[PDB]
Symmetry: C3
């Protein structure tokens, strides 16, 4: 069974400078509140061990999302691209845009493209100056992405901003209605507003959902499964959010879920492959 | 079992002019995404066939809900009155309004009254000028309907407006708070905000819920059924939203639902008969 | 096995003046609508009968939340204090604040503490001038409470204000994020926004939930129980909202809920004991 993890941050090179690795104290309370044990690979910061766990889980590849902050938290687009160039058979790079002016944003897009990266990630709720995903300032970016067939990963669930308004489902819904041909992946699946986001995905045929860590024993779990077994078969994406969840435990739990066999295949790898193939252009 | 369907738009007269019938390609996509096959009578645009399916489903009467929408189609109130008077044993007419100003709204309300029609439907999120149901401009209309004991159907679930803010339960809650003696039916049951609408109904004793098609295999199903088995027994309405759902298949599915038998009877006919009594004044 | 009821308004003293006892007919709609019969001690307003029902239910103590409303009636802080000192093995007093001005609040907080009360309750949605719990004007109050280790109870669930925006989880989520070491108990558990408030409790470690009456056969019931059995075992508080619910029927139902024993004892008494220890300093 082929598995592609849509949120997987390796303990490798520039990623060891991220908060998920420099502050394991914070990451571990989160992993533990979810009901899991910290992966040994993440505890030890061992890429070697991570590869072993990937293998034992059945995960062939990963989608590596950074943070292009330029601050201490950062893992630059250059560094995500170095990781992918070092294990090209294992990690797909995603470029993140983190920008004050629209000129900076397009200078960063220029660099992302030149690095051979083709999927962009936006997390505007965690920027130095936070904004909502439907902020007027982000609209030139979406127009560019839509006109160029570029898929956009946007953080609209979990701790997507300084407070819960940053996951309110009105913000992504505005964006999808105003860019009806733009491919959007909501990372964390817009959790916890699951009732609402199922309706959004129902209405907005371009929206993919990746609940990741938040599918595990939390509100909305039933709703996601129910939708995966109907209209959302082709628009849901397996993901662990590793290192937040351990690879082996999470994947082997996901594999027992009451999802119909052809939808399982799409959620595990087919939907991702389709996304990646669209990006490649 | 007597059964009154609270949302039916038969393939007759003006109703054939609405996008529900003029774009069956769009409608049938929605019907199949929900998990149904299109009604043959709707495919054929045939009243004969519609009556036969109604009889085969065990549905005695239908509430013919007007629509006036500059995008979605317009069916005149004169036609809604004419369909009902041609089949007075089968059909209860509901008039609709599309207005940009309060006087435009009151003139249309008066036309509707003059035609013999005693209930009004409002779908302001799909008007020429889209508005929230708690728009200031609707308030003098609500005061009139409250003062005269006129029940009001309002669309505040599903695709009620350009984006998901037009289903946010804050809008219908304000109305009920400002017009505490007004009978309101929420068409589509304010879906997807299903945890919240049950609270609105708990608090506001004159709110009725008719989730219709959005009951089927979607989030909130369990919440609706639980309330139906409790305080909402008196205030939920069976409706199919035909031609979005086939009469026969929807009704048979509905009749297998775990809803206590005394509640099932009120929901299938008792609750609507009390509403139609009230509109009888 | 010891039960501490986190919300119990006994039929004595000043409490006899609240709208929960002066309007039995409103109360009783909420009670029967939930599915209970009114407690015989509430009907008669007999304290001695309440003590009988309390012991029959197994409840050892109750937290007496005073109301300082012009919308829901009044029991002054002196009265709450008098109930507790007349029944010191049975009642824990909670002080409430209703004020326009910062200086008015600070003087009420001074009297609360002079009366020997160590917990404060805030229900600003029901003041003569309703405000949200994150209104700028409450921030000085929260700052004092956080610096002084005083636990704050705030009503952010149920009929918390004029309309459902007064329970939107964005409001308590701001207060918890701006006062990360303030102990907050959400009375009514911010129902109906149960998917949302679970994420909020997940994210904000100082939040305690007390859904009380709203845990009964209503949406979010399973979201609450699921979190009680995991990360919220230490942060959930049993309570009946007596006289809104009968003590014996509610407690018997509650005791049979699928909650593991170590989590069950915390929710029944251990968490409330910890809060009371905190308030005792």
């Amino acid at each position: 069974l082929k598995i592609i993890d849509f949120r997987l941050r390796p303990p490798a090179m520039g990623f060891l400078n991220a908060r998920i690795y420099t502050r394991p104290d914070i990451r571990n309370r989160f992993t533990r509140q979810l009901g899991f044990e910290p992966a040994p690979s993440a505890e030890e910061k061992s890429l070697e061990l991570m590869f072993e766990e990937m293998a034992a889980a059945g995960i062939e590849q990963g989608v590596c999302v950074g943070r292009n902050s330029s601050v201490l938290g950062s893992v630059s687009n250059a560094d995500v691209a170095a990781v992918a160039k070092a294990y090209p058979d294992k990690f797909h790079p995603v470029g993140s845009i983190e920008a004050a002016t629209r000129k900076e944003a397009m200078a960063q897009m220029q660099e992302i493209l030149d690095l051979g990266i083709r999927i962009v990630n936006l997390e505007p709720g965690v920027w130095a100056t936070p904004m909502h995903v439907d902020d007027r300032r982000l609209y030139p970016l979406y127009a560019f992405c839509e006109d160029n067939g570029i898929p956009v990963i946007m953080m609209t669930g979990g701790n997507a901003g300084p407070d819960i308004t940053y996951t309110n489902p009105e913000h992504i819904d505005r964006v999808l209605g105003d860019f009806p041909d733009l491919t959007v992946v909501s990372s964390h699946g817009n959790w916890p507003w699951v009732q609402e986001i199922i309706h959004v995905a129902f209405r907005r045929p371009n929206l993919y959902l990746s609940p990741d860590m938040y599918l595990y024993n939390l509100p909305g779990h039933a709703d996601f499964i129910q939708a995966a077994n109907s209209f959302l078969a082709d628009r849901m994406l397996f993901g662990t959010a590793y290192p937040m969840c351990p690879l082996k435990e999470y994947t082997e739990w996901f594999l027992t879920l009451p999802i119909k066999p052809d939808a399982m295949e799409k959620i595990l790898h087919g939907n991702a492959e389709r996304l990646l193939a669209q990006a490649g252009r």
